[PDB]
Symmetry: D3
Subunit: 141 residues, 6 copies
């Protein structure tokens, strides 16, 4: 079920400057989620990273995916009345290609286990893989 | 032709954050037309104020994005006057047709009409192949 | 002669930092005209980008200022629809004459021309001044109640 | 003489979001300076002070007068080629009236003493909205 | 544990970002003394302005932080006056001794002198060292 | 001493506000280990969005923090290459044990494992502490010299 940006902030507690999901285009509960984060020069981190070369910081690509991952969790089982999810561990992260101003970062997250929730995440720009995440781990606290 | 990425955009335009609204230039023909894009993310400083309860890209910011793209065109068309500080002099016939929202790609084209400094240009911006804004005439001064 | 202060403007308008650009409303007549001001300070977030070597108020933000003021008038002329989300639908005949600089007071007047409850079509003209002298002219602003 | 913001930036090292003089309207070397700071809703401190009632922080009023005091010093004597001035002391500050968005804060600073090249300048300062005193300062002391 | 973490400070002070300058209250004695801290990081908004080539914490922001700390003590000392919007009315005998820099832990103590109309003293330390003295902060 | 203060950090790292997350280097030994710290203040811009109701230091930023300290060690161990623009190639074995909060001092250690300046390729391990106690652990941080 497709989601525009007002409804994301109803699920997630993240606000500016640390909401890194712009749209949710496809979601299947307990299974997968697809979404995007538009990379514009008009974002606050870009001045710091870097003055002479504007490149999306890798860690913020993790955060992006992790957030989209967390939307899936909250919409797969919100029985625990808590939207405050905390990153507990992350493993097998590979950055292949610089994400630059102008790109669309398309993102896919797959639920492995919900016991502590564990997920994987891929990031595409132009159908080409830019980030890989073997395993994001999350523990609503 | 060749794409002018952002680092090279900042070498042409004097605009900086939080008022640089052109992310990439995909095609430019000197003295004629220019196509650019602006990626609209929730991670932009203006969104918290427009509006807290419904994030919509201010319409005047779309004009500003288009007028900056038009400005790139002018400076590469004739830099004989190597002053990059161009000021908006007039704008005419602006119609916004659809809300530009976070998640969108604002695709933009500007068209040089006349040039002498005084230059005139038309602008159009699209999201998903659909017209979001039209500008008959942007007028500019050196 | 109602004097409206930033807290009460924040009750009318859904705009917030950094895109609220009316600081005060000095005169308002419902269904007719509104006069207000915006103080122009170096200490605004837009000025670092426009421009590094020469701070000048972006003309579009002068458009926005006058629009927001105009939209105040609209919501105090007719709030029967309790929606405060007005979008810009069209603008026509905009002339910038003088540069608006840090230190200036931007006195603004918007006049209501037509108000159609058909589509939510309100139409307004707008003039901005610094020191009694015209800095911006707008022949027609068109707005759409969402 | 009147001084624009562009020239203010030539004299003062202060940059956004800590430059609090928008215009110098009258200056006399070695004696007195007059200047203004336009107070808009569109400043980054206003969200923090305070969400529910927007009041210009008093310490920022002190800063604004201090920056204006600073300009006068640098134009009264720039034999010391150093624009980086440090507040060393402040005495006799009184806030009378809340400074609000939409106000013009007109400021005046009066040089009291200058030790040329110990770098110790002393000055007084007053701030006004609408002809009415909003801030008094008995003595700013600076480390040049 | 006689202290107050950030979430609890925000229930006391109306101040928010970018003008909340107390991170943690480590000791407090009602009607007497308050000890607090503020961590000084390059990643703070004011440091780009002051100064581009030499990051120094604005002295007035040292005054503001101490005053904020003093403000918590007042309110926890007597909240019968049901108002958390305190205004600075005056400040006296402020002396800056040393620059405060990114990386320092600004440790601050404010001492209540008189109430009802509140007057207090303030001292700031980096590494035991006195960075700022305030003889008298006046509140109403 | 072996202490680099913020000014010298900014000569080594290209990072600026709001993405410079090493405040001070307290001990460094070239080609081996580095100890630095990041001061956690409520007066940082990320805290407003993470989270409104509960200010917690984004875990990812704790990675960046460590990686930037890792980078300082690499650029001082070997600056053969006239390039300070290090990109994160991959990260591995990250655990977050305890929330980092406004008021904490994040004390950080990164250790060099392997370096081949032939390619411009380095690997590092990292641990973050608050009050002597572990808050973050990182098995492997991999970085490219681009
Ligand atoms: Cl006109 C003006 C100028 C500067 C600061 C202020 C008020 O500062 C405060 C507000 C709220 C609280 Cl609860 C405080 C507490 C302590 C110190 N200052 C406080 C008023």
């Amino acid at each position: 079920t497709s989601i525009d940006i007002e409804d994301i902030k109803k699920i997630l507690p993240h606000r500016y400057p640390f909401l890194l999901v712009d749209k949710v285009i496809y979601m299947q509960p307990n299974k997968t989620i697809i979404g995007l984060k538009q990379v514009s020069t008009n974002e606050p981190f870009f001045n710091g990273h870097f003055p002479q070369k504007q490149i999306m910081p890798g860690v913020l690509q993790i955060e992006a995916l992790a957030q989209l991952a967390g939307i899936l969790c909250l919409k797969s089982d919100d029985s625990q009345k808590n939207n405050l999810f905390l990153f507990a561990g992350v493993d097998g992260v590979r950055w292949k290609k610089p994400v630059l101003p102008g790109d669309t970062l398309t993102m896919q997250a797959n639920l492995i286990s919900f016991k502590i929730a564990k997920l994987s995440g891929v990031g595409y720009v132009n159908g080409k893989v830019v980030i890989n995440i073997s395993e994001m781990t999350f523990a609503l606290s």
